[PDB]
Homo-oligomer: A and B are copies of this chain.
Amino acid sequence: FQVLFVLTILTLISGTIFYSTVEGLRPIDALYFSVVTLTTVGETPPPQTDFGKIFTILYIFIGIGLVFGFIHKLAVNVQLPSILSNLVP
């Protein structure tokens, strides 16, 4: 979880650096693009540079497994227990 947590953050930082410089986005919008791309939500418009498109294609393949792995350990063993160890008054 600490590790998975670190990878995800490093992955989102990379994305954020990439999209602010190549697509011209403010940091916050570039992190947002990164997270909604990798969680496969995708509610923003697509990148407008060919360079953005290529990076996004590869970023998607490398990131998704990471992000979803983090999301899965996050849910199965930081929430349910918390949540369940929670019922038992």
A57 to chain B, nearest CB (A): 5
Q: Is the interface of A mostly helix, strand, loop or mixed?
A: helix
Tell me the number of copies of this protein: 4
* Residues of the B chain whose Cβ atoms lie less than 8 Å from the Cβ of A60: 35-36, 39, 41
Interface of chain A residues 6 through 43 with chain B (CB within 8 A): 7, 28-29, 31-32, 35-37, 39-43
Q: Find the residue from A3, A37, A41, A42 having the highest chain B CB count within 10 A.
A: A41
Contacts from A to B (Cβ < 8 Å):
3, 7, 28-29, 31-32, 35-37, 39-46, 50, 53-54, 56-57, 60-62, 64-66, 69, 71-72, 74-76, 79, 83, 87
A-B pairs with lowest CB-CB distance, top 7: A65-B75, A42-B43, A41-B42, A32-B53, A42-B42, A40-B41, A43-B46
